[PDB]
Design a protein that fits this description.
The structure is cut from a larger assembly and holds chains A (75 residues), B (113 residues), C (133 residues) and D (60 residues).
Chain B: E1 8-16, H1 22-38, E2 42-49, E3 58-61, E4 67-70, E5 74-82, H2 87-96, E6 100-107
Antiparallel strand pairs in B: 1-5, 1-6, 2-5, 3-4
Chain C: H1 4-17, E1 22-26, H2 29-41, E2 46-52, E3 55-61, E4 78-80, E5 89-90, E6 104-109, E7 112-114, H3 116-122, E8 126-132
Antiparallel strand pairs in C: 1-3, 2-3, 4-8, 5-8, 6-7, 6-8
Chain D: H1 13-18, H2 29-32, H3 36-51
Classes of the chains: A mainly alpha (75), B alpha+beta (113), C alpha+beta (133), D mainly alpha (60).
The complex binds magnesium ion (24 copies).
Chain C binds one RNA strand of 249 nucleotides through residues 1-3, 5-7, 9-11, 13-15, 17-20, 26, 29-30, 33, 53-55, 78, 80, 82-85, 87, 89, 107-114, 124, 126-127, 129.
PDB class: ribosome
Keywords: chloroplast, translation, ribosome, cryo-EM
Entry title: Structure of the small subunit of the chloroplast ribosome
RNA sequence: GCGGUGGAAACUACCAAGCUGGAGUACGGUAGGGGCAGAGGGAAUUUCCGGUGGAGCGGUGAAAUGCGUAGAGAUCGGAAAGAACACCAACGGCGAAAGCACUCUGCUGGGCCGACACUGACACUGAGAGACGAAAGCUAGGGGAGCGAAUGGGAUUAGAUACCCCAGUAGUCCUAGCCGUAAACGAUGGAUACUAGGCGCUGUGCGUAUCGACCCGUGCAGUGUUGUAGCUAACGCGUUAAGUAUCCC
């Protein structure tokens, strides 16, 4: 289905699992074990994005405008 | 065969006071079957084994204020498929009743050894 | 595998110190050429290539134990020089020579890989890959 | 030699009472010669049964 | 050494396209005291209310303080409260570390394994910076059985501001925060590659054994004990290196 390994699909799966995790992190604030994972996965997504910005400028801008991902920290 | 579509499998044991009749027992039966089915249970399968002496004496206070000391007990066994969301009230709803002296519920996992 | 050259070298050094004649190494233009050269200098018995799952392996036969394994007068040394951290180059008049010439120095130059001998004949300098005793 | 061919639970009392001491203590894995997985499952079972008063903590 | 010009193109760098074995994604499995939250459980202890009973209990190297005829302890029957979870438990399990174990349910973090299903170097490390971080401690509100700094009595002693005994407040517990230190120890930063074995365990996978439990041999992933090469000032370390090399702090 599409490419399940494609950059943009992966970044999506990540952004989505993160915004999902957000609710759990809001309800139970004392769970640090889970937050540590969040920070890890966010790291992954951020990496892929940096990579994709290097490789293709167009696909990148399209993607972060599409998935409502916050603009990059290289500015 | 049993096949849940987006549900969790469950077993529940309930222990009731020995002083009960079969009509009061079936009324409880009916009641809890209805709570389950009202909670989205597809397949309520109930089974009964009543009146066994307990390992140990248990005490239950009533709403009438009675201290009831038991020896025997009524074991009700429930296989049912409910959403993980809806198992929440059931357990307390079992605790709250004066007729239910000891309740416990288990999730069932497939055995692979 | 930050450095590939160093790694080949190491697999040799290790298999050597443990008295085994046979080594598996992973091939590459560099690897292959270096091993060729190693053969024409004569530090190693025989080379050959293998392939599986799109992987290439040069197996190296190695010079037999010295008149037993316990009593070894000689080992076969190897040393990385230009390495990712610091790359060493040399002109024609600084070209290294090893133990008065008993050992050999490998150079990558404009004309390809060679020993110091070749570099002196042709008058070329370049990047010094490693030394061999 | 000895083995579990039947699903072990808290309601197979025959089973669990094999692996229980006279005093109702749980016997160790080294004694019962069970795989670690088994032993754990037994243990939790015994505790659950103990709560449901199917088997006693202490004796009479 | 700097500057101009003419050549070479291996290696670093650049530019264009490719490739999976590195790193990930999906898919399917499976073990687990991972974490947060919510239910439920029983011993034991302490106090209180009774019945019995009627001189000592309790404690120490030996004593005494103490508790007791206003009925102690002992024993049976009641309630009530808090805290900790016997056996399992193991030279076992998960966790980044701190740590995590009566039971259960729910929300969720990782791990590992087998398949090409996919992307195609997306890697490793990390100055600054951020999060977590035993116990003691602190602010605010609760809670207060046991234990117990401080404190007091009793001893012991030349003395005893100690060790022992009798009491006993903070604190230990919960909620919301601060503090950021420990022999926070493997006294061993991280990643990758590569180099005998023997005996063990945990997870899975394969073939065999039966056609389901073993069983065997094996493939991985981690974990434990001896030990060869090699290393080391010795002790020792030894595929989980303190070995042979590369990179960053
Ligand atoms: Mg120069
Ligand atoms: Mg010049
Ligand atoms: Mg070229
Ligand atoms: Mg490229
Ligand atoms: Mg009780
Ligand atoms: Mg008394
Ligand atoms: Mg571990
Ligand atoms: Mg999980
Ligand atoms: Mg492609
Ligand atoms: Mg720092
Ligand atoms: Mg903090
Ligand atoms: Mg504290
Ligand atoms: Mg103070
Ligand atoms: Mg005390
Ligand atoms: Mg004093
Ligand atoms: Mg006290
Ligand atoms: Mg706090
Ligand atoms: Mg320090
Ligand atoms: Mg230190
Ligand atoms: Mg066996
Ligand atoms: Mg291993
Ligand atoms: Mg050791
Ligand atoms: Mg050793
Ligand atoms: Mg050292």
């Amino acid at each position: 289905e599409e490419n399940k390994g494609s950059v943009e699909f992966q970044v999506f799966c990540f952004t989505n699992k993160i915004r999902r995790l957000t609710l759990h992190l809001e309800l139970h604030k004392k769970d640090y074990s889970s937050q540590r994972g969040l920070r890890k996965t966010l790291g992954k997504r951020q990496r892929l994005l940096a990579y994709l910005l290097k490789i293709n400028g167009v696909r990148y801008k399209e993607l972060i405008s599409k998935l409502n991902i916050r603009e990059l920290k290289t500015r | 065969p049993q096949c849940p579509p987006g549900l969790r499998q469950y077993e529940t044991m309930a222990v009731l006071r020995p002083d009960m009749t079969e009509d009061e027992r079936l009324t409880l039966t009916q009641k809890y079957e209805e709570l389950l089915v009202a909670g989205g249970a597809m397949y309520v399968e109930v089974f009964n084994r009543g009146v066994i002496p307990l390992a140990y004496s248990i005490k239950r206070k009533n709403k009438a204020g009675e201290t009831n000391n038991y020896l025997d007990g009524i074991y009700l066994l429930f296989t049912y498929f409910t959403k993980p969301e809806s198992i929440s009230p059931l357990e307390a709803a079992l605790v709250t009743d004066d007729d239910v002296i000891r309740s416990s519920s288990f999730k069932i996992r497939k055995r692979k050894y | 595998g930050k450095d590939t050259i160093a790694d080949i070298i190491t697999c040799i050094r290790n298999a050597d110190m443990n008295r085994k004649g046979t080594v598996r190494i992973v091939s590459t233009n560099i690897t292959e050429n270096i091993v060729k050269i190693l053969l024409r200098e004569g530090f190693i018995e025989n080379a050959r290539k293998h392939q599986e799952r799109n992987k290439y392996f040069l197996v190296l036969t190695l010079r037999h134990r010295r008149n037993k394994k316990g009593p070894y007068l000689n080992t076969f040394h190897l040393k990385r020089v230009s390495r990712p951290g610091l790359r060493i180059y040399s002109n024609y008049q600084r070209i290294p020579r090893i133990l008065g010439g008993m050992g050999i120095a490998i150079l990558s130059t404009s004309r390809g890989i060679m020993t110091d001998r070749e570099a002196r004949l042709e008058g070329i300098g370049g990047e010094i890959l490693c030394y061999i005793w | 030699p000895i083995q579990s061919g039947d699903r072990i639970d808290y309601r197979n009392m025959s089973l669990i009472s094999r692996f229980i001491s006279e005093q109702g203590k749980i016997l160790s894995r080294r004694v019962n010669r069970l795989t670690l997985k088994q032993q754990r499952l037994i243990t939790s079972a015994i505790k659950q049964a103990r709560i449901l008063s199917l088997l006693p903590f202490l004796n009479n």
